[PDB]
């Protein structure tokens, strides 16, 4: 009777997707959050002129900002035991059979959800990281006079994001390929297979290229989003006309948003494309 250890198992992978999904919506919202925080910086760096209110200015920034990534990371850990229960009501009800196969499969799951978890805290650590050095290059911008020093605070600024972006590429990389070593090892051991086996573990490796081409391309849009904001730093130190700055930055608003949406659809393709593999699983057993 393993069709109903096999449903068991569809049944946790087809809850984990939508989880990870979940996961995706509140992450791209948690860089909304945070972008709109780098606009309001440099409204009140074009817009103030007086030190210490511009310096209480900056402060409520960072406080806020320090309270979305709390959020955040409070959603990561959230699904980190929400897979936990998902994932012990696959080992209850398979714990009575006797396939080592069964389990094997859960071995898989399992694995794979921790890197999908490892692989959203370095999406986020990369938003945090940008976020914290937007905020001391426009610190040090709005004290800042004399260009020798601008200049080296946004080539700072610029070095120092593409190695945050990088850190995070390279954390989804391996990501990606130590995904596929649990799964192609999974496969490996269906044929020491029941077509069952087969089909499941096709579908959850499916489900798992979704998930983290998605996080992929939600860390592109983070590495545009923070390319607008480099220029941006730049116009507010460089122009003298707040009327004109101002317009600049409306600009950014406008193509910021426009990158949302983007994002945002990319998360319900993969939500869409999902929901079609679960169900053709499920029309399996």
Sequence with gaps: SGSELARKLLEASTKLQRLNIRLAEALLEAIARLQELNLE?????????????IRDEIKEVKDKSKEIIRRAEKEIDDAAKESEKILEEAREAISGSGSELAKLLLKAIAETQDLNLRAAKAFLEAAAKLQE???RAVELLVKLTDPATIREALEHAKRR???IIDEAERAIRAAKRESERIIEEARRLIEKGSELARELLRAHAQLQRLNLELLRELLRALAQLQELNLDLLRLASELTDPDEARKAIARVKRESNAYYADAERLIREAAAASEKISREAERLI
Excluded: F, G, M, W
């Design 41 to 53: 910086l440099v409204y009140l760096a074009v817009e103030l002129t007086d030190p210490k209110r």
């Design 133 to 135: 050095l937007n905020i």
């Design 161 to 163: 994001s593409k190695e």
